[PDB]
């Protein structure tokens, strides 16, 4: 079996729009993503998701709700990424551009799927329907899915 590392992903989803972050330079520049990163020792996953949202975007919320869990496997990497996915309840602050990331709102009829991780095309729609999910995606590099599962669940 494999070991897994914990990550978070937060979708700042409002009734008509979603806030995404564009990676500004390096490996995978121009890709839009939710906000998140690695869970740290001692914090709950939800608290880590809030912390990462703040560090990454400048936003605070005071509450998230869990919407899904997705495991990513990359060819050549033995460690799995176990990504815990949340959506915001309500938000405080304006988002801020950093050296790493530029935030932008997108209307929900303009979700930039071609410039997002390919898996997002599969699980976003569930997210938008306010449903919960478990997923797994195996990637060759950044663009090619070799195997995946996706299942709606009642409890994440
Ligand atoms: N296939 C994928 N689909 C997706 O929608 N988000 C993905 C993804 N693969 C990775 N992500 C997200 C998960 C998480 O929010 C982020 C990856 O976290 P990072 O490794 O950048 O974390 P950290 O910034 O904590 O790491 P350090 O570089 O160690 O500081 O990208
Ligand atoms: Na981090
Ligand atoms: Na990050």
Author numbering: 1 to 156
What do the paper's sentences say?
In the nucleotide pool, which is more susceptible to oxidation by reactive oxygen species than DNA, human MutT homolog 1 (hMTH1, human NUDT1) is the most prominent mammalian enzyme among other enzymes responsible for sanitization of the nucleotide pool. hMTH1 is characterized by broad substrate specificity as compared with Escherichia coli MutT; that is, hMTH1 hydrolyzes different oxidized nucleotides such as 8-oxo-dGTP, 2-oxo-dATP, and 8-oxo-dATP with almost the same efficiency, whereas MutT shows high substrate specificity for 8-oxoguanine nucleotides. Here, we carried out structural and kinetic analyses of hMTH1 and demonstrated that hMTH1 shows broad substrate specificity for 8-oxo-dGTP and 2-oxo-dATP because of the exchange of the protonation state at Asp-119 and Asp-120 depending on the substrate.
Then, we crystallized again the 2-oxo-dATP complex using the hMTH1(G2K/C87A/C104S) mutant to improve the crystal quality and determined the structure at 1.00-Å resolution, which is referred to as the 2-oxo-dATP complex (high resolution). The improvement in resolution of the 2-oxo-dATP complex (high resolution) compared with the 8-oxo-dGTP complex by 0.2 Å significantly affects on reducing the associated bond length standard deviations (from 0.03 to 0.01 Å), which results in high precision analysis. In this case, a residual peak around Oδ2 of Asp-120 is observed in the resulting Fo − Fc electron density map contoured at 3.0σ, indicating its protonated state. Although the difference in the C—Oδ bond lengths of Asp-120 was 0.04 Å (1.23 (1) and 1.27 (1) Å for the C—Oδ1 and C—Oδ2 bond, respectively), Oδ2 seems to be protonated due to the smaller associated standard deviations as well as the peak in the Fo − Fc electron density map. On the other hand, Asp-119 did not show a significant difference in the C—Oδ bond lengths (1.26 (1) and 1.25 (1) Å). In contrast, during the recognition of 2-oxoA, the protonation states of Asp-119 and Asp-120 are switched in comparison with the recognition of 8-oxoG. The hydrogen atoms at N1 and N6 of 2-oxoA participate in hydrogen bonds with deprotonated Asp-119.
